[PDB]
Amino acid sequence: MNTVPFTSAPIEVTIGIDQYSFNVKENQPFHGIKDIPIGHVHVIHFQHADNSSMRYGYWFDCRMGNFYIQYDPKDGLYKMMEERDGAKFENIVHNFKERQMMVSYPKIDEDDTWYNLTEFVQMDKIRKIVRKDENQFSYVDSSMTTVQENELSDPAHSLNYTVINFKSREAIRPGHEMEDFLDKSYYLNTVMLQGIFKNSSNYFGELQFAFLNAMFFGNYGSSLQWHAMIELICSSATVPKHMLDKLDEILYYQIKTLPEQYSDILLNERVWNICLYSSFQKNSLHNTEKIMENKYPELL
């Protein structure tokens, strides 16, 4: 069980940790989150009471260091930092617990939700999408744009997701124009799986990370990336059976976890109706299809 202490809470803010969140009042004595499960990535995110614009947050993994949060009154936001003095850090953590000023990561023991949403997400890959190599943790916010979005402006702040484009030379072998555009199996399996991602777990990891960024920050480019990676699979006639089964599980827990009130902007009608009902894999997403119909029949 690991801990992320907070130096203070000077401004009124809603704090999230993974799918949980807590309201904290201006200069309430809040000093961290404890009992955070080791073994998965995590995200701690913020939304100031005064600016329901710009949700922001930090991906991290407690195995990679001792991290803590500190409000910065110049930049006006809660910053994640690393403490390198291991002794000085257990000291702060232990004194804050003794005073009981820390909330407990509130995991129900039956609940695999977070595992299921992050099964394939690995910190190492996050730090390639969010390049900032002097920190072990990664910042994301509502307004950050992706590399593809930038192509159609500041690259230091870009989400370097893998660029997918169905009408590109990459996607289309010369002489197989019609074949490849109607059956993306080539693009999926050779170009993307074998070529760029190397295996399905990295692909699933990027898909899951894109969804989580869309959900927690309303990051629109991430929503686009998540839909594109689903569509690439659902629009391929030839998919390894281990991928289809896992995809149904992945999407199920993602649809299950979304706030009900957000289905309008986060869920692309065309892609979902095509994946569930028109595509090659229309019949391979039984759990994802059952939950979509029983929760958002409108969008369909």
Binding site: K167, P174, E177, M178, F181
Partner: protein, 237 residues
């Protein structure tokens, strides 16, 4: 973006552009089989690729042999159209390649775009105009060359004959589309109007009769009257 009544004069500026119409690419007859089921028989078709400024027409003849053993022919037709248009562009010298291709049906956008990936600076555009180019097989000489073909064949024509010696592109295209609209709404009457007078002949190297300027006025008036009449009959107005 899309082509409409507002940006109509762009067709006649000096940016090379082509219209592509695929409506006659996949042509069938529908008949009854011995067991009483329905079957189709393909006949020869053509891609109608036209430069509206110069009148040059690139009539690509689609031989029934193309369909042999293929499924989802109506879908395939769109891809074969885009394949052949792309090959036409590749075959032309750089300075003759179009800057825009305007497809008369929106279903052609994705096939063409995909086939034209090698030409990112050629813009593929839809149109909101309701152009009459499907009636191109009502022009006797075009229908004749399509139906006689025994192999894939490209045949070149100027669809304006020699009109441009005497009128502007704008006026030529309005005449062409008026003639085709008429032939589409009522071929039999349209063709009657064109040939009634046996003393007005079609040159061997032309598609339409050698009307004088005054005779074209009478013709155009006669085609307008034909079109408006058929409208009242269609809608009871």
């Amino acid at each position: 973006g899309a082509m409409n009544s507002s940006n109509y004069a762009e067709l006649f500026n000096n940016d090379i552009k082509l219209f592509v119409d695929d409506t006659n690419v996949y042509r069938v007859t529908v008949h009854k089989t011995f067991e009483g089921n329905v079957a189709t028989k393909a006949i020869n078709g053509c891609i109608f690729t036209l430069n509206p400024k110069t009148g040059h027409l690139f009539l690509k003849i689609i031989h029934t042999s193309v369909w042999a053993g293929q499924k989802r022919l109506s879908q395939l037709a769109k891809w074969k159209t885009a394949e052949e248009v792309s090959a036409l562009v590749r075959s032309l010298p750089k300075e003759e390649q179009p800057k825009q291709i305007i497809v008369t049906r929106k279903a052609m956008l994705d096939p063409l775009e995909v086939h034209m990936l090698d030409f990112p600076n050629i813009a593929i555009r839809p149109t909101e105009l309701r152009l009459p180019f499907s009636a191109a097989m009502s022009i006797d000489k075009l229908s004749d060359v399509v139906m006689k073909a025994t192999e894939p064949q490209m045949v070149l024509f100027n669809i304006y004959d020699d009109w441009l010696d005497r009128i502007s592109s704008y006026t030529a295209f309005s005449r062409l589309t008026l003639l085709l609209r008429a032939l589409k709404t009522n071929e039999e009457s349209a063709k009657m109007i064109l040939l009634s007078d046996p003393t007005i002949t079609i040159k061997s190297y032309h598609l339409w009769p050698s009307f004088t300027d005054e005779q074209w006025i009478t013709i155009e008036s006669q085609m307008r009257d034909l079109i408006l009449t058929e409208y009242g009959r269609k809608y009871n107005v």
